[PDB]
Amino acid sequence: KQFAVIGLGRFGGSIVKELHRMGHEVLAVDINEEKVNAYASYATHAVIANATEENELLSLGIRNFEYVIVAIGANIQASTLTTLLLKELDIPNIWVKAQNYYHHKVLEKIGADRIIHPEKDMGVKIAQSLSDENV
Amino acid sequence: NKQFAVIGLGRFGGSIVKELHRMGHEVLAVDINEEKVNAYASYATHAVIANATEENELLSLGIRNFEYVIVAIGANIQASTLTTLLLKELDIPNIWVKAQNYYHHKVLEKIGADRIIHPEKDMGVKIAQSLSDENVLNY
Amino acid sequence: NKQFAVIGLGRFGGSIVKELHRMGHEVLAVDINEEKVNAYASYATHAVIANATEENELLSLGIRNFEYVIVAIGANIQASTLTTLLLKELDIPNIWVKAQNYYHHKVLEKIGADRIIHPEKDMGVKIAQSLSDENVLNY
Amino acid sequence: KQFAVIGLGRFGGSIVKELHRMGHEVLAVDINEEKVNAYASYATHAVIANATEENELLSLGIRNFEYVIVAIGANIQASTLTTLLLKELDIPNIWVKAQNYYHHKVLEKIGADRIIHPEKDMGVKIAQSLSDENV
Amino acid sequence: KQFAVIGLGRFGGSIVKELHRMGHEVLAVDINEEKVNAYASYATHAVIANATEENELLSLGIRNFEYVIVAIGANIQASTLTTLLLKELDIPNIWVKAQNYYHHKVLEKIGADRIIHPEKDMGVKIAQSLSDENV
Amino acid sequence: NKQFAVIGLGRFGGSIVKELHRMGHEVLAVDINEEKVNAYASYATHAVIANATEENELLSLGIRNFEYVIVAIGANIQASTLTTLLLKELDIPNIWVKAQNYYHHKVLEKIGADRIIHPEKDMGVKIAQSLSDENVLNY
Amino acid sequence: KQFAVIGLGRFGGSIVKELHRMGHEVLAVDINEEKVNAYASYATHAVIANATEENELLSLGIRNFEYVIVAIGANIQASTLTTLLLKELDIPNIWVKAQNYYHHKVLEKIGADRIIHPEKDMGVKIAQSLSDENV
Amino acid sequence: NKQFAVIGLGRFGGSIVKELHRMGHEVLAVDINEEKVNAYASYATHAVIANATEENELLSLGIRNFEYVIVAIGANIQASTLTTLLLKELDIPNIWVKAQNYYHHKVLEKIGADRIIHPEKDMGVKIAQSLSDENVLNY
Ligand SMILES: Nc1ncnc2c1ncn2[C@@H]1O[C@H](COP(=O)(O)OP(=O)(O)OP(=O)(O)O)[C@@H](O)[C@H]1O
Ligand SMILES: Nc1ncnc2c1ncn2[C@@H]1O[C@H](COP(=O)(O)OP(=O)(O)OP(=O)(O)O)[C@@H](O)[C@H]1O
Ligand SMILES: Nc1ncnc2c1ncn2[C@@H]1O[C@H](COP(=O)(O)OP(=O)(O)OP(=O)(O)O)[C@@H](O)[C@H]1O
Ligand SMILES: Nc1ncnc2c1ncn2[C@@H]1O[C@H](COP(=O)(O)OP(=O)(O)OP(=O)(O)O)[C@@H](O)[C@H]1O
Ligand SMILES: Nc1ncnc2c1ncn2[C@@H]1O[C@H](COP(=O)(O)OP(=O)(O)OP(=O)(O)O)[C@@H](O)[C@H]1O
Ligand SMILES: Nc1ncnc2c1ncn2[C@@H]1O[C@H](COP(=O)(O)OP(=O)(O)OP(=O)(O)O)[C@@H](O)[C@H]1O
Ligand SMILES: Nc1ncnc2c1ncn2[C@@H]1O[C@H](COP(=O)(O)OP(=O)(O)OP(=O)(O)O)[C@@H](O)[C@H]1O
Ligand SMILES: Nc1ncnc2c1ncn2[C@@H]1O[C@H](COP(=O)(O)OP(=O)(O)OP(=O)(O)O)[C@@H](O)[C@H]1O
């Protein structure tokens, strides 16, 4: 039921807007206040927080969500520390955006339930979308 | 026969080439970098080394003959817009382009791109969709 | 009344503004840089500070009302193409743009520029013409 | 009668092509061989030379021309040394492309007969071209 | 008994030379051949390998060692993937050089037995060395 | 009283300051950056903001009065060598310096550094020692 | 009798201090106010001015000096425009610091009475100073 | 015989080599750049290509045998200080060095340079002297 998105970049921010459009409630979070404001109107709650800090993770209630998506970008360290922590809180489903090959490999062994690769995944989508031309 | 062609064998471009191959489709794969072209020899019917911004090289490829041509050039807005510009000249039925940002999208719309892809954002909506399906479709 | 507008008050843009003033024509002068706008206050009917790439700022200027609009933005192909892109949307009767190179020229042709200026090259032909006149016209 | 162009950049190169199209003979010169080749077909003679070197200027015969245009670009020093030398050879008309304000001022006091400013000059041309709309 | 050092930088390379001087046998490994050669004379065996690749880790016999030190530097991703893999092979003691705060935190939760911080640790050493002045 | 002074509150410098405090020793902590000086106010008897390369600022600090002065300046070989150069002038009984590389070490030896620290390498030998102790001392 | 120094860099500034030490009066000038202040105590008069501007050159009285040294540095254009102007005012002796080979060549043809090359000239000085070891 | 050696054949270094030759003195000219070494073959008894910062290369040159050695390395304070550091080790009777700035001067004083040259400033005093002579000596 619950949906929480950590990291409001193009990928993460986009999934927050879609959840909203599809009439779903979503907790949006990011360390950058500016980022949090840009999506405040699309989320039930938009909170400024460093997903690395366990104390901020608890005062956030993140442990109460069924699905938490980690969409941190360039900061690969924050990304794996964050999923490591969500895994300690036993979040049912934690999906993570993988920055690169090594990142996927660490995430796989860390406890991420689904690893997302925008570029590659969108690529197979377009290939299947190309075939559909004659379906 | 000569239905699909992909220019730019990066993560995105190369991925559409592999998937097409897996689905048993013929695919023309091109890049300016030879190391990229050699990495996709086992997936493309033909994998040629060429500069998509060169009008002559586009003829030596036969591109004017494909129904769909994907411009998957990355961090080079210039090479990307130039290329789709040359493709529209050869009146390609369908030219799809990976956009880098809002600026790039704006020029591609007017320059001839029939479809514009924004991997990050677009994948975001599909992830939202998968999440909704987990609960709504009761999956 | 509202016949000419020049966006980009560099050497080229500012020069067309001054000459127009000298010829007694009304001219709308714009730049994003205030120091540039203040340097042309004595030559333009109105000298406004604005970012030509912003759709809102283009309305707050009234640009949709001019017959000729010159995009004289320099070393910023992006700001330049974006701007002429917004101008064509507002259906400007005549939009003239200073091109930076071959690539820039190619996008401007398809994006809406009615005339494209290449200062260096273009001035070269006129200099050739002046040389021919020195001898041919016996001057 | 004679026309010689020193510096085959966009400005200089362009005036060589126009002279040719208008059926005129022109001596084209530049220090960069590649540049000289790009315009070899448009000039009666295209020669590789450093216009700074007096010896190369004489083995070039530059002193025999009525009009010599100095179209050196960024190398402002070469530009003023070159016009200084052409002035010593008493060339009838020496026209020079001015790089900036100080450059114009030195050229003016050095002996350049006409100082050309592409950007500014093309600017008044466009202003006059704009008026002509109702002429 | 067994000692294996992954990453032959200043830190890792230095521990290999000391083990040798103290008459100990040590397996030295690095992805850069040049690095491996610089320490070939100090180790019983010096092998070129990407510690990220499980296949290279096995053809290396790394699983047979009692102590394996991961001294990768700037490549923080390789560093945590490498310790993650050594942990899967159940190496008795795996000591890791921590690049920064987040890195220590991930390493701590990953299975590193000892986390080393050259700068900080050498710092307390000097403080204790300063006191000893009057001991 | 005025026994230890540490210039440069980076990872290395700040660490010696904290440990000294933990051991109950008085310590003079200095840095040019105020944010660094404020981060160590709870560990140093006195935490002053100063540029160790300035002869005047070194007098306003009283440095000539300490038995041991640690130059823990990092990625600034110049600020580092200059500083130890000024310290040797004031005839400091003991001046210890963190070296950045072989070049830096070579100049520090001749410029007056009584002891030169190479964190990475030096820590490497101690780690080797700990490993030997695990087996040799049967620990 | 009169001495004026234009450009208070290491070279120009140094000649102002020496003239002062040797009990001579000197007019010091530079476009940068900070520069002018750094030598205000060594000159009879220290004035802020752009030596390129003829109006500033006259309100300066520069034309009344017997020796004017142009010590502009990187701004080679200002340097040659400035000597060109001092030459129009017919200054008896104008000495100029040459930035490079082309610069010397233009200066030579412009009217500079003496061209100074710190690096090269100091070089022959040291060679002669080396010989003197056995003189 | 083996009286003078100059390391660094830039404007300054090369100039001392030429003048020495003109005065009929033997001179050992060295540089790391071959194009610089070839430009001074007609002025030096011996013009060798070597890296003055390498202890071995300094022995293969015989430098320990010269009374005067000039370090005329330019925009490389490191190569400059390192070199004079190695020269002082070989106990050179006289080592003269071109300084780049105040910082460089300060390290050279303590590292072994017997004389330090600051071209710009130093030439400034000589120019002042020439000016005084024009009037004072009534020249
Ligand atoms: N420790 C953290 N806790 C919470 N949010 C974080 C943390 N670290 C980074 N973020 C946020 O995650 C987001 C990272 O997405 P990112 O900025 O890398 O995408 P982008 O660069 O904006 O564009 P793209 O998606 O194409 O890479 C940023 O908005 C950033 O503020
Ligand atoms: N002018 C060109 N003609 C043909 N191919 C080109 C041209 N310019 C670039 N390419 C190729 O297109 C690809 C661009 O993708 P990119 O440079 O962003 O690498 P990538 O990051 O792995 O791809 P992606 O951004 O999808 O992850 C490269 O393989 C590059 O060699
Ligand atoms: N987005 C923009 N909107 C409006 N004006 C702009 C914008 N971007 C740049 N300009 C202005 O346009 C002018 C660009 O000309 P440029 O930057 O090349 O200086 P310039 O070299 O003197 O002009 P020129 O190239 O003709 O000699 C500048 O005055 C700049 O401030
Ligand atoms: N000393 C010289 N003698 C002869 N030719 C020279 C000399 N110095 C420079 N040139 C030539 O003059 C030309 C300078 O024009 P330039 O290259 O600056 O224009 P550009 O940079 O190509 O484009 P633009 O005209 O817009 O500045 C060059 O082709 C250069 O090789
Ligand atoms: N995946 C890997 N497998 C094996 N070795 C690796 C791997 N990745 C990096 N290394 C090696 O680990 C070492 C990293 O240490 P590093 O180079 O960062 O220290 P340094 O930069 O040389 O100096 P410092 O210790 O002060 O940082 C390198 O020699 C590198 O080749
Ligand atoms: N001239 C100076 N005088 C006094 N302090 C200085 C001076 N220059 C730099 N410092 C300080 O010395 C410290 C240098 O350490 P550094 O810049 O390498 O940061 P760091 O990496 O955290 O330290 P370390 O290299 O030990 O990890 C900084 O806190 C810096 O502000
Ligand atoms: N047009 C001008 N009129 C008056 N003074 C000028 C003018 N242009 C430059 N200057 C001054 O001339 C001086 C140039 O000397 P310069 O700064 O190049 O030497 P430096 O860079 O400080 O060190 P060095 O002498 O080794 O090059 C500067 O102080 C500058 O402010
Ligand atoms: N490590 C070295 N050993 C020997 N020679 C060196 C070394 N490093 C640099 N050099 C040489 O010393 C000279 C340095 O002078 P520089 O780089 O400043 O050129 P320059 O500007 O013409 O000399 P100057 O500053 O006197 O005008 C160069 O010829 C360079 O090749």
How many residues would you count in chain F?
A: 139
Strand partners, B19: none
Q: At what angle do helices G10-21 and H119-135 cross, to 10 degrees?
A: 40
F43 and E CB contact within 8 Å: no
- What's the sign of the alpha-carbon dihedral G8, G9, G12, G15? positive
Sheet with strand F94-98: strands edge to edge = F46-49, F28-31, F4-7, F68-71, F94-98, F115-117
F117 within 8 A of F98, measured Cβ to Cβ: yes
Q: Cβ of D2: how many Cβ atoms within 10 Å?
A: 18
Nearest CA in chain F to H109: F111
The C-alpha atoms of residue B92 and residue B112 are separated, in whole angstroms, by 9
Residue type at B119 in one-letter notation: P
- Non-local (6+) Cβ contacts of E89 within 8 A are E57, E62, E63
- Non-local (6+) Cβ contacts of F116 within 8 A are F96, F97, F98, F99, F105, F108, F109
The residue contributing the CA closest to ligand 6 atom 21 is F10
The C-alpha atoms of residue E5 and residue E95 are separated, in whole angstroms, by 10
- The pick from B7, B73, B85 for probing ligand 2's pocket by mutation, whose C-beta has the most ligand atoms within 8 angstroms, reads B73
Q: Cβ of G95: how many Cβ atoms within 10 Å?
A: 21
- Non-local (6+) Cβ contacts of C114 within 8 A are C94, C95, C96
B78 and C CB contact within 8 Å: yes
E26 within 8 A of E50, measured Cβ to Cβ: no
C96 SS3 class: strand
The C-alpha atoms of residue B111 and residue C71 are separated, in whole angstroms, by 19
**What are the backbone angles phi and psi of residue F76, rounded to the nearest 5°?**
-145, 75
The C-alpha atoms of residue C55 and residue A39 are separated, in whole angstroms, by 23
Best to test chain E binding among A53, A106, A107 (most E CBs inside 10 Å): A106
The C-alpha atoms of residue D103 and residue D80 are separated, in whole angstroms, by 8
Which of H119, H116, H96, H114 shows the shortest CA–CA distance to H105?
H116
**What are the backbone angles phi and psi of residue C5, rounded to the nearest 5°?**
-145, 135
C44 within 8 A of C36, measured Cβ to Cβ: no
A4 within 8 A of A26, measured Cβ to Cβ: yes
E6 and F CB contact within 8 Å: no
DSSP string, F58-93: HHTTTGGG-SEEEE---S-HHHHHHHHHHHHHTT-S
The C-alpha atoms of residue F100 and residue F76 are separated, in whole angstroms, by 8
What is the token pair recorded at C106? 């190619």
How many residues would you count in chain C?
A: 139
CA angle at B50 for the pair B47 and B51, rounded to the nearest 5°:
145
What does DSSP assign to residue C118?
-
- Non-local (6+) Cβ contacts of E132 within 8 A are none
Q: In the G/H pair of chains, how many CB contacts fall below 8 A?
A: 112
Find how far residue D44's CA is from the centre of its chain.
16
Which of A10, A47, A14 shows the shortest CA–CA distance to A31?
A47
Which of F90, F136, C102 shows the shortest CA–CA distance to B85?
C102
Q: Which helix (H) or strand (E) segment is B95 a member of? A: strand B94-98
CATH of domain C1-139: 3.40.50.720
> Cα–Cα distances in Å, from B52 out to B48, B71, E16, H118?
11, 9, 51, 56
Nearest CA in chain C to D115: C127
Place of tokens 């987040």: E102
**Strands H115-117 and H46-49, bridge-based pairing:** unpaired
**Residues of D58-69 as b/e, b for ≥16 C-beta within 10 angstroms?**
eebebeebebbb
Radius of gyration of chain G (CA): 15
Which of A77, C83, H130, A93 shows the shortest CA–CA distance to E105?
A77
- Non-local (6+) Cβ contacts of B97 within 8 A are B70, B71, B72, B80, B84, B108, B113, B115, B116, B117
Q: Where are the domains of chain G?
A: 1-135
| C75 C-alpha to ligand 3 centroid (Å) | 7
What is the token pair recorded at A115? 């690893």
**Strands E67-70 and E3-6, bridge-based pairing:** parallel
CA angle at B26 for the pair B21 and B27, rounded to the nearest 5°:
80
Pick left, alpha or beta for residue E106 (phi over 0 → left; psi -120 to 50 → alpha; otherwise beta): alpha
What is the token pair recorded at H61? 């040159």
The C-alpha atoms of residue G16 and residue G67 are separated, in whole angstroms, by 13
Radius of gyration of chain C (CA): 16
- What's the sign of the alpha-carbon dihedral G102, G104, G109, G111? positive
Residue G10 annotated in ligand binding: yes
Nearest to G12 among H18, H124, H135 (CB): H124
Q: In chain E, which residues have their Cβ closer than 8 Å to the Cβ of A98?
A: none
CA atoms within 13 A on the CB side of B12: 23
Q: Cβ of D130: how many Cβ atoms within 10 Å?
A: 23
DSSP string, A10-72: HHHHHHHHHHHHTT---EEEES-HHHHHHTTTTSSEEEE--TT-HHHHHTTTGGG-SEEEE--
Residue type at B132 in one-letter notation: S
Helix residue ranges, H only, chain B: 11-22, 34-38, 55-59, 77-89, 102-111, 119-135
The C-alpha atoms of residue D79 and residue D7 are separated, in whole angstroms, by 9
- Non-local (6+) Cβ contacts of H136 within 8 A are none
**What are the backbone angles phi and psi of residue F52, rounded to the nearest 5°?**
-60, -15
The C-alpha atoms of residue F46 and residue F7 are separated, in whole angstroms, by 12
What is the token pair recorded at F139? 């620990």
Find how far residue A6's CA is from the centre of its chain.
5
- Non-local (6+) Cβ contacts of E3 within 8 A are E19, E24, E25, E26, E27, E65, E66, E67, E69, F131
**What are the backbone angles phi and psi of residue E66, rounded to the nearest 5°?**
-85, -40
Sheet with strand A114-116: strands edge to edge = A45-48, A27-30, A3-6, A67-70, A93-97, A114-116
Residue type at H10 in one-letter notation: G
H2 within 8 A of H28, measured Cβ to Cβ: yes
- Ligand 3 close to Cβ of residue D119 (< 6 A): yes
Helix residue ranges, H only, chain G: 10-21, 33-38, 54-58, 76-88, 101-110, 118-131
Radius of gyration of chain F (CA): 16
How many residues would you count in chain D?
A: 135
- The pick from D14, D32, D54 for probing ligand 4's pocket by mutation, whose C-beta has the most ligand atoms within 8 angstroms, reads D32
Multiple choice CATH, G1-135, 3.30.1330.60, 3.40.50.720, 3.40.47.10, 3.40.50.150: 3.40.50.720
**What are the backbone angles phi and psi of residue B48, rounded to the nearest 5°?**
-100, 150
The C-alpha atoms of residue H44 and residue H27 are separated, in whole angstroms, by 5
The C-alpha atoms of residue C85 and residue C54 are separated, in whole angstroms, by 11
> Are G and D neighbours with ≥3 CB pairs closer than 8 A?
yes
> Cα–Cα distances in Å, from A47 out to A33, A78, B13, E39, F27?
8, 17, 36, 51, 42
Residue F138 annotated in ligand binding: no
G80 SS3 class: helix
Pick left, alpha or beta for residue A17 (phi over 0 → left; psi -120 to 50 → alpha; otherwise beta): alpha
CA angle at B48 for the pair B45 and B53, rounded to the nearest 5°:
130
D45 within 8 A of D27, measured Cβ to Cβ: yes
Distance from CA of E55 to the nearest CA of A (A): 15
What is the token pair recorded at C18? 């001054």
Residue type at A24 in one-letter notation: H
HEC profile for E52-71?
CCHHHHHCCCHHHCCEEEEC
**What are the backbone angles phi and psi of residue G82, rounded to the nearest 5°?**
-60, -45
H116 SS3 class: strand
Which of D119, D73, D77 shows the shortest CA–CA distance to D97?
D73
Q: At what angle do helices A76-88 and E76-88 cross, to 10 degrees?
A: 40
Resolution in A: 2.2
- Non-local (6+) Cβ contacts of D123 within 8 A are C11, C12, C13, C14, C15, C16, C18, C19
C9 within 8 A of C34, measured Cβ to Cβ: no
Q: In chain C, which residues have their Cβ closer than 8 Å to the Cβ of B110?
A: 85, 110-112
Find how far residue A20's CA is from the centre of its chain.
15
Strand partners, A51: none
What is the token pair recorded at H133? 């002579």
Q: Cite the beta strand spans of chain C per DSSP E.
A: 4-7, 28-31, 46-49, 68-71, 94-98, 115-117
Best to test chain E binding among F16, F100, F105 (most E CBs inside 10 Å): F16
> Cα–Cα distances in Å, from H59 out to D87, F103, H38, H44, H96?
55, 20, 21, 19, 19
D55 within 8 A of D29, measured Cβ to Cβ: no
What is the token pair recorded at C61? 């200027």
D90 SS3 class: coil
What is the token pair recorded at D95? 């026209």
C31 within 8 A of C53, measured Cβ to Cβ: no
Place of tokens 């210890």: F96
Whether A78 and E103 lie within 8 Å, measured CB to CB: no
Nearest CA in chain H to G115: H127
The C-alpha atoms of residue E83 and residue E91 are separated, in whole angstroms, by 10
The C-alpha atoms of residue D120 and residue D125 are separated, in whole angstroms, by 9
- End-to-end CA distance of chain A: give it in Å, rounded: 35
Which of C34, C29, C33 shows the shortest CA–CA distance to C12?
C29
Find how far residue B61's CA is from the centre of its chain.
16
C78 SS3 class: helix
What is the token pair recorded at A61? 């209630």
What is the token pair recorded at H59? 């022995």
The C-alpha atoms of residue H98 and residue H77 are separated, in whole angstroms, by 10
CA-CA-CA-CA dihedral for D29, D34, D38, D42, to nearest 10? 30
Strand partners, C138: none
Q: Which helix (H) or strand (E) segment is H69 a member of? A: strand H68-71
| Deposited experimental method | X-ray
Best to test chain B binding among A15, A96, A126 (most B CBs inside 10 Å): A126
What is the token pair recorded at E124? 């307390």
The C-alpha atoms of residue G36 and residue G99 are separated, in whole angstroms, by 22
